[PDB]
Ligand binder design. Structure first.
Ligand code: I65
Ligand code: I65
Lengths: 302, 302
């Protein structure tokens, strides 16, 4: 028992981090086979034209350090907002991997890195407004976010920038930003966020699995009537697809999904009355149904 | 900016996990050089006498799997509550490492493991009552907890057992339990816990570093008067040593330690009034002063 903000084991990703330096700019890169992926604003020189900035660069302008070893850059290309530096050596620690673009509400592990060296690992969710509430300092750009499926690393996030509210914006590993953000230092802001309803419900099921039941009640609700209360509290709408995903958790605990919705409704309307759930005094929304199953059941990775 | 429950990168420890099987019992072991460390109750056959159970075992009774490779056991010895299995092969992925016994209030990363395969990583603190609030299922015993200092892994915890309240008990890597617990399935219970005061104060300094100030006030307090209020709310006493440790954080923010104590006092006496600090509606006590400095300043590991 117990329930924790669990990250994936990070070793497979640690073996891929490197330092990219060009001009006076240094940041992190991701070394998979003979390519290094990094944010394109590593390149020299408000509102830049990156195609024009890149044609002016030479391969030897790029200093790539992998540990105590310099890698030689033999080609480069820009894809959206990431640079791909082709190097003369394939990374021998390259795991099995995929690049995936996730939906809002999905969670992932972040390996925070400075100068190509890993600093720490933590669990994040992609918010409905396409920011992440990360922990990132200057020099962290190029750190990646990932999931691990059995033996395969699915990279889903590369960090680029921090917004005025202290939240973070970045891209998938093919360089497409999540949300409306652009990689310029022009004024931009997050957009209003909402609570990830299907995740809050998954976390309530985790609480039941772990012996917490105090928040349950005898009522039920319709999907429609639930969504009417959800709207009022800035929760995103629950769909029939969300209901179906919560299926396994509902069957394991014997609590109908709409019955758990009735419990969430009463918690929204009444507060928690000075009581906690899984060690929290807030309704937690950064665990997916998959996260709960994986941790309350014990899936590993080879 | 941002502040997260950050674990250490786990790769150096992942390379040391193995599976130990003897009889019908399988659990995790830690492979450093040519020794495998695991909990001694791996051995065959309420109230066991382990010296007597161990003399009856043979080296070939122990099946140690490291990936797809069986390691051969060529000796064994018991040290307190851990077994040490000498194997014929030194682990080539052995990091630089130390074994350390930590004090209550100290934090560490836990690499949860099943059948020798890592499942997830999370951050823990040793509670004042010498339990940890982990996330552990059947088969997790032998998973380890650790800190990383630059290049060196300091192992401080090996998991053994779960207590009726859902918290966890275990040993240092030389087999000495934290707290009064014994490795038998006789009735045992945690003992009343207290809040780690110096950690709550460190976390309030983290909130200030990240732009939260709403909980500060104009008052001050004496150490003695503070401790009188702390007692009433089940907080452990703050000592002059705690005050000195909070030194660097106090100087970086310009808030005197006893001034921050006055703020904590007012938060204890008044509640948080429906407001949050660093995304929490509770006073968080599982970040040390070191944790805060490391994350708000960006220390890495090579
Ligand atoms: C790559 C360097 C890096 O580590 N990093 C991550 C910073 C953190 N803490 O996560 N990224 C940056 O520092 C980027 C670098 C620029 C280079 C040019 C191309 C875009 C990225 N800058 C910022 O993160 C920057 N944000 C920003 O400019 O947002 C747009 C904006 C501008 C002006 C007013 C309002 C919004 C940060 C450093 O600026 C603050 C918002 C002031 C923190
Ligand atoms: C090594 C197997 C393992 O994974 N593991 C971790 C369990 C979790 N979830 O963390 N450890 C155990 O399962 C141990 C195995 C025994 C073998 C004999 C020597 C001691 C350890 N058992 C327990 O964790 C057990 N606790 C326990 O017996 O506490 C003492 C006690 C007994 C009776 C009444 C009250 C306290 C668990 C499995 O028992 C529960 C407390 C019922 C959960």
């Amino acid at each position: 028992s117990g329930f924790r903000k669990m990250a994936f084991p990070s070793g497979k990703v640690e073996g891929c981090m490197v330092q990219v330096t060009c001009g006076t700019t240094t940041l992190n890169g991701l070394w998979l086979d003979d390519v290094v992926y990094c944010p394109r604003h590593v390149i020299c020189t408000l509102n830049p034209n990156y195609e024009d900035l890149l044609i002016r660069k030479s391969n030897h302008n790029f200093l790539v350090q992998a540990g105590n070893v310099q890698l030689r850059v033999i080609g480069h290309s820009m894809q959206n907002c990431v640079l791909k530096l082709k190097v003369d050596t394939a990374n021998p620690k390259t795991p099995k991997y995929k690049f995936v673009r996730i939906q809002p509400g999905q969670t992932f592990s972040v390996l925070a890195c400075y100068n190509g060296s890993p600093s720490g690992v933590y669990q994040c969710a992609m918010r409905p407004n396409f920011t992440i509430k990360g922990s990132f300092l200057n020099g962290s750009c190029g750190s990646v976010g990932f999931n691990i499926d059995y033996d395969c690393v699915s990279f889903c996030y590369m960090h680029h920038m921090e917004l005025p509210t202290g939240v973070h914006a970045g891209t998938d590993l093919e360089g497409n930003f999540y949300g409306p953000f652009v990689d310029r230092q022009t004024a931009q802001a997050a957009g209003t966020d909402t609570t990830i309803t299907v995740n809050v419900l998954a976390w309530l099921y985790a609480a039941v699995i772990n012996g917490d039941r105090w928040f349950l009640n005898r009522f039920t609700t319709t999907l429609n009537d639930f969504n009417l209360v959800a709207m009022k509290y800035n929760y995103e709408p629950l769909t029939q697809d969300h209901v179906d995903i919560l299926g396994p958790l509902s069957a394991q605990t014997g609590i109908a999904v709409l019955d758990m919705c009735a419990s969430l409704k009463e918690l929204l309307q009444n507060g928690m009355n000075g009581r906690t759930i899984l060690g929290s005094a807030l309704l937690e929304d950064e665990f997916t149904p998959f996260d709960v199953v994986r941790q309350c059941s014990g899936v590993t990775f080879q």
